[PDB]
């Protein structure tokens, strides 16, 4: 031991630090940082790159003769010996002339990109990307973008895709694949899908991404894909539609999730195996599960000017609005004639506000199901109250920041809203035809105290959509208006009031070719929770339960009054089996609820034929 | 000084307060208490009665020579030298043989009764009355009870009336008065009126009790009397209704008070002087305030079994129910046709619940105004929450502890109420016909959810009145039910739904004798607050304002739907000038609000006449 330290000092001419060099063979130029070599397989420039010493690096290559592209006996190069540390500037001083180690890579064939992907060193990835690191360098498991996702390093993958858009193209060399396909995590599916990613990019064999999520039993990504437009029923490798691949499991959640989003149940694979056959083989659960779906010439209906008048009444509600979407869809398909072109009047309160306002602008219905599924995650991030940046601006984008209300008027539409500007707390109908000016009874004005009122006539679609759609027991103070759920929450009863008011405005004006009788009124409710006894804040919040309950008397009133006039009130909503609350964002229970709704449509399925019958008659 | 104390010691043979007893001439037999006389107007036996020395009293007449019936130098007797003290047993020891002093009376005429009544020695009044004190002895101000009341001694008057109910009969000899008339104090009017005191008591001239209260300008007692049933407009002395007696003053508070409680303005006195004439003579306030300035053959109408059907819908509300009473009364008087006999159907929610239930049992409307004025002080003694002992027990009294609901069916009636037994929080109508057997669609049960709760058949008037009328934001948990203000709170919509439901049950049952189209529905609301702007717990309570709004859209809805059917909805209620709250007990503000209502009736002389016109039409 004495001779070792004698040589150590006799080098030191060329304390507990460097003593730990014993606890082992450095050299003068090697340990001079704490083009020579080591007995463990190292290099001095590599250690001065690793330890984040940048001026010592300036003093090792610019001052001394030490070539930069040094490859040790362990595979590594000078570039990716620094990304194990935290320098990020050594990379900049090494990205110079006569230094080609960027594509020189053999740990196991893992380019500096891939190593920075394995660890999580994102800033290192950016530093490499500004220096043209050639993400078109095929690796062991695939290209560098796939390496970021094999390990689920979020920041690194995000930086890669931000610098290079083209990386949404690259295919996994083993199986021709998208970045999504062989890379699955609930959040990552979204953080790539929001980027404009095609989900139907297929495969080597032909397997979709949701095929991969289903085969591995990750319900999360099945949902993330169906929401963002993935199409169930894709044949794939063996003609096994994603439905076959779920029945091969015991995941009823996923089977119902796919059946809701449109998968057929008789479609056979390449071998002829129908998925209902699969079901009856596996369990009796699934065979009982799958009985989901004739003069169908659609006799005498279009969007034209003739006798009667159809009304649609979309209640407010939570994210539960999806229920009515489903209902609408099964009506829309049971007549085939595109809900918007089916009804002459359409009214909505809160989520039905958003939805009615949408089906005015010629937005399709499954598309809207997707929209809510994509929005529930952005909007309901909060404790109880939400600052509405997400909801307001999501509507800005979804309907247009400059699109004003009365630009469309294809069917007449009305969104509710509680004008909380006044202690009276009146109701404002957001309307897009003109206005009903009738009769001559201003009950609060025309006497003194007070006339600073506003009522902004008819503009700014997104602004009205927010002023309607926020059930404010949840959101916040929201400008001048709160939900029309504070007063109406179920326009069914109130929209007929507006019908007759506007008709008397028309007639009084001598117009006289008013569209006559509301021949049909159809009110869709976002489901009913089940009936719990209460043998008793649960004694101070029942005020709000009553104030916004749409499925109590506001059915009986409207119905008996429709029977007074000749209307055939048609109230549609399913008994769910759960207290699905308004701001529910676990889409597992939301999908279960959509299945609940479709079971309701199945169980009735007669009322629907009779309603379509009425809706298309002469 | 030496001689005075010499006589004091020579008396001490005939212990430190005797010098200050000297300083003015007592004697041996005189000061032997602290049959001689005095130089200040006194007597020894009188002092042995005054000082409450009973054993000295036994030792002054039985042992010593002291006649009992000694009259002092200022008129007073031995009896009412003791009621200046507080013995009350010496009186009985003097209520013995050779003692006729009960009617021994001369201060200026002050019976033992009158002295004990003027001072307040109530126990003395009782002791004398138990000893046959012969109250038919005119004193200075009338009889002894009137002497008790000229000085407003409650204990004494109450004791007199306890011994003799007959003393609420006796008239002031000078003018002839119930104990009311020549005896005025706000509280005593009540503690005498609650005893069964008749207001129909006349005067010498013929003056009512409120005549004395008004001419003397004691607004307190005017209110206390109009409250307990006094009838303004009694002609009285000169044909001067108590209204004439206010206009000669400048007390507008009282003028409004009398016109509200029914005083006319066409009523001439003996001289032909209309009271509005008095006004225009007196002031320009009063000239503008009062004056009013003919098919009255009652053509072809009663309440029998014929074509159409009338409905009445009395909103809920606070103690403000008086408003609708006022309206009803001013409607009733404009037709003369006795509300119960005028409408075939009647619905009520909270105060209108009690009120409709009252007009069902043929309890008159002025009577209900009185009832509320007498009850409001009893029920609302609490800060926010009230334990309902007063309300529940007041209904027990006012409607009968054993009177069951369906004893009447005179007009069909329905009271609202929120059945809080269930998390759905349904609505139950307390009904008295039988029940409407719905189209057989019970959509909330039949998925066997629960059958341990019960839907309690038609019984128990007072219990239902409470289960409806108890606003639980104010009162308490109230059994299974809360206010009908959480629900309908303006039954008009729900009452018409129920009308039609019952009519279709009738027709469905093969009856074929439908009563009819309800040709008229009249909705009377407990006033409107004035319109307050809001530029902002006032955002957690505005939820409740919305939930219980009876004058917002539930007017427009009902109205436009009646225009669908042919009904001529009649919404009647006044713009108050104030936010009169629920548990308001200052009857001054309630009276101002009734004046607001009567001004509303003034301006609406067209609507009311048209409503009565239809109410009696073919």
Author numbering:
A (entry chain B), B (entry chain A): 81 to 94, 104 to 112, 118 to 128, 146 to 404, 409 to 651, 671 to 752
Cite, word for word, the article reporting this structure:
Calcium-independent phospholipase A2β (iPLA2β, also known as PLA2G6A or PNPLA9) hydrolyses membrane phospholipids to produce potent lipid second messengers. The sequence can be divided into three parts: the N-terminal domain, the ankyrin repeat (AR) domain (ANK) and the catalytic domain (CAT). The lipid hydrolysis is executed by a Ser-Asp catalytic dyad in close spatial proximity to a glycine-rich motif. Here, we present the crystal structure of a mammalian iPLA2β, which revises previous structural models and reveals several unexpected features critical for regulation of its catalytic activity and localization in cells.
The structure of the short variant of iPLA2β (SH-iPLA2β, 752 amino acids) was solved by a combination of selenomethionine single-wavelength anomalous diffraction (SAD) with molecular replacement (MR) using two different protein models. The sequence assignment was guided by position of 51 selenium peaks and the structure was refined using 3.95 Å resolution data. The electron density map reveals nine ARs in the structure of SH-iPLA2β, instead of the previously predicted eight. The crystallographic asymmetric unit is formed by a dimer of iPLA2β. In contrast with the original hypothesis of ANK-mediated oligomerization, this dimer is formed through CAT domains. CAT domains interact through an extended, largely hydrophobic dimerization interface with a contact area of ~2,800 Å2 formed by three α-helices, several loops, including the long loop 554–570, and a part of the central β-sheet. Importantly, the active sites are in the immediate vicinity of the dimerization interface and in close spatial proximity to each other. By contrast, in iPLA2β, the active site cavity is wide open and can accommodate phospholipids with long polyunasturated fatty acid chains. In the crystal structure, it wraps around the CAT domain towards the predicted membrane-interacting surface. A single anomalous peak was consistently found near Trp293 of AR6.
